[PDB]
Design a protein around this nucleic acid. Sequence first.
DNA 1: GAATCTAGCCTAGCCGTTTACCTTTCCTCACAG
DNA 2: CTGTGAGGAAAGGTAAACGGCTAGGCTAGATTC
Lengths: 638, 134
Amino acid sequence: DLRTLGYSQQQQEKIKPKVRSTVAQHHEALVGHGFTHAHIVALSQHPAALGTVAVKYQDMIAALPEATHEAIVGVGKQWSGARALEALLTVAGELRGPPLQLDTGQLLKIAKRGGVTAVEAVHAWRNALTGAPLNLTPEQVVAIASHDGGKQALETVQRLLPVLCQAHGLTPEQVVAIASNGGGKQALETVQRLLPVLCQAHGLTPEQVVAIASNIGGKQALETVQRLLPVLCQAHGLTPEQVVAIASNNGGKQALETVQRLLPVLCQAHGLTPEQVVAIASHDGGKQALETVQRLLPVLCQAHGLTPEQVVAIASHDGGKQALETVQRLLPVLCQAHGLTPEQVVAIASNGGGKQALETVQRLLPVLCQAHGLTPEQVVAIASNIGGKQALETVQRLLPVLCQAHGLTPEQVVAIASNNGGKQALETVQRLLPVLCQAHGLTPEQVVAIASHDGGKQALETVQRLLPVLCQAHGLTPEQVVAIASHDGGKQALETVQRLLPVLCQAHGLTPEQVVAIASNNGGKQALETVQRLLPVLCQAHGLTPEQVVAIASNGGGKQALETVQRLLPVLCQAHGLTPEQVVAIASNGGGKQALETVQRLLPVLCQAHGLTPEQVVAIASNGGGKQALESIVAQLS
Amino acid sequence: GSYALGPYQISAPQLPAYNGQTVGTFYYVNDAGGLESKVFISGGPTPYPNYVSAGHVAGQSALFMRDNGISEGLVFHNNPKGTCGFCVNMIETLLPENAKMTVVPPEGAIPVKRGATGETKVFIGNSNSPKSPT
DNA sequence: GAATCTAGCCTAGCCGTTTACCTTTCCTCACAG
DNA sequence: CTGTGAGGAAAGGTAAACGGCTAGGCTAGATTC
Ligand SMILES: [Zn+2]
C-alpha cells in the first residue's frame, strides 16, 4: 500500500506493520511541510508524533526559529516525543528570560535527552537552582538535566550538596561531575554511604573514590570494589591502583569479576603477564575483550601468524572484540586481493573503531587508487587514525574541489587528512582559506601548516579570532603566531600566551622571544604554568639563573623535566659529586627526566665495575638519546 | 705484528727519537726476497702535494708500490702516538686493486686527537685512481 | 505503561618520549707570503 | 712568524613516527513502580 506513495522495499520493511496506516494518513502534510521519506521512516518509533508534527509545525518554528528538520525528528522519535514538543511550545518563552538565558540548541538538547519530566522540572525549580545555597550556573543545570533519568539528579543535588560539601568535604564541581551521568542519584547516595568506610579501612584517597563514581553504571563498582579488593590484593597479588584503574570504566563490576575468574587461566595456559591482563581489562567492555582473547588467541596465533603481542595490542582499546573478529574475517581477502601486508592491517585495526576503518578500506581502496591517483600507502596512512572512516569518506568527496578551486596538491590534502579528526580540518580549510588569505595576509602554505595537526580546526579558529590583538597590542609578528599555533594544542598555547605574557615579562624580567620559545612545543601551556610557578623557587633555593630554567623548559615535556630537576638536584649533588651545570646539561634535551633517572641508577655500576669516570658518563648522557646509550651500549655489551 | 711469510721473520728495529718527523720501515717482495726499510723518514717531493696522506710516512708506499708492488705491504713506525686520522680514510684510493697494511708499535696507544686507532687495519682493496693535481 | 538505571561501541582533542635522515665540524709525520 | 686541499668517520639538530589519556555523544536491552 505504501509503494504507491513512493517508498522503497527496505523502507517499507522497516516500518512496523501496525503503523503503516498512520503514515498513509499523514504523508501528504509531512511532504508539504518539507520532510523527506527517510525522515518520515525515522519518525516512526513514536507513532503519536506524526500527528503532532503534522498539525502543529508553524508554532514550532515560531517558538524555535533556528530549528531544522533533523533536530525536530531527533527530538520527536524518543519515548516522549509528542509531550516534550508540546511542553516546548509552552515553556520556551519563560525559559528564555532570567535567570537562565537559554538558546534554541540548549532547549532542543535538554528536551531530546531528558523528556517532558526534565523540561517541567527545569521550568519549575529554576529560581531555587540558581541561587543560594546552591549557586549553580545555567550550563551546569543544562549538563545535569540532559540525561535519561533527570528530574532525579536535580532534587538529589539540592538535598545533598551542602551535606557532602560540609561533613565529608568535596569541591562542588566534583559533585556536579558525579551527578552529570546516567543514574547520578544512586551514585551520590552510594558515595555518601560508603566514602568513610572505603577511606578508613581500605586506605583509599577521596579522589580515587570520586573517579570510580564518575561513570555511567556507578553504585555497582563501589560495592564490588569493597567486596573484592582484599581477595584480589592478597590471593592474586595485585596493587590497589590496578584495581582502581580496572574499576574506573563503564561496567567495571563485570571487568573485576571476569579478571578474578580468568587471571590464572590466561596467565598459565596461554602465557601472559598480569600487566597485559590488566591492560586488556582497563577499557569499556573489558570482559568481552578478555573472553574474546581467550577464545581467539590460538587460532589467530597459529593460522594467521600474528604473534601474541599484536593480539594484545589490538585488544587493548574500546570495542576490542569487534576489531578482533573483523581482523579474523578480513585478513585473507585484504592480504590476498588488495596486496596489503599483515602489519598494515594490524596498524589499521589498533585504534578505537577499527572495524569501521577496515570495512571502509575494503570498500574504498580501488576507487581512491584508480580514480584520484593515490598510492595504497597514502590510504593506509589516512585510515590509521581514530575515525579514519570519516576521513576516507570526506577525502573522496572533497579532493577534486580543493585541488581545482583552491590550487592545492594531493599531497597537502593527504597530509591534512592523516590526523585525528581530519574530517573537520578539511571542511574548515575549505571554509576559511580565502578569508585567512585575504583579510589577514597569509600564504596557503601557512594555512596548511596550521591545519596539518591534531585539532587543527580549533587552531584555525583561534588564529582568526586572536591574530589582530596579539599582533597589535603585544608586538608579535604573524610568523610567531603561526609558529605557536602549528603544534598540537595550538588554541591552548595561544590563549595561555595571551593571558600570561605581561606578568611573565614584567614581574620576572623575561623577554617575549623566551615566552615564544617556551610555548612553541607540544603542551606549551603546561610548560608556561610550571615555569611561572617554579622560577622563584629554583632561582632562590638553588643556585640557578633564568637562562638555565628557560633552556630546560624550551623542550617537549619541560614540566616533567623541571619537576624532576627540583626533586633530584640535592640527591645527585650531595651523593655523586655532580655540579649543577652538568645536571642542567643532562635535563636540557627531550626525555630529560628519564635521562636523569637512568644516570642516578647507573652511575655506581659504571664507576665501580667498568672503569668509567663521571665526566664520561655525563658526556654520553648530555646528548640526545642518553638513556639508550647508557642502558644498552655501555651496560649490556659488557 | 709477528706474522708473515717469505724469506724473512716479522720484526723491526726501533729508533727512539721523540723529535724530528718520523722513522719507518717496509718489507716488500716482488720476485726475489729483497727488501729493506728504503730509508723512508718523512715527506719530500712527490707528484701529489694536494693529498695530505702523500706526505705522511705510511702513504709514501703508493709511490713504488703502484709502480712495482701489486703484493701486500709491511710497515713499522717510530712515532709512538698513532696513525693520523687523515690516513684512516684517503689511503684506500692510492694503491692498486689489492694491497695490505700493517701494525704500529704498542707504545702509540694513547691517542688524544680524533681517529688514531691502534693496530691499524689491513687496508685492503679500493678500486679508484689517485687524482691528478690542478 | 511510564520513567529510570546499566553495559558496550565510536569520534575528537591534548600531552610525552623515541627513532630515522639531512647537514655543519675535525683530523699533520707538510708549508708560503 | 700565523693560515691552506680531499674523504669518509662522528656529532648536533629539527621533524616525523609511535604510545597513552580525557571528555562527550548515541543506541539497545534490563529493571523498578
Ligand atoms: Zn697521515
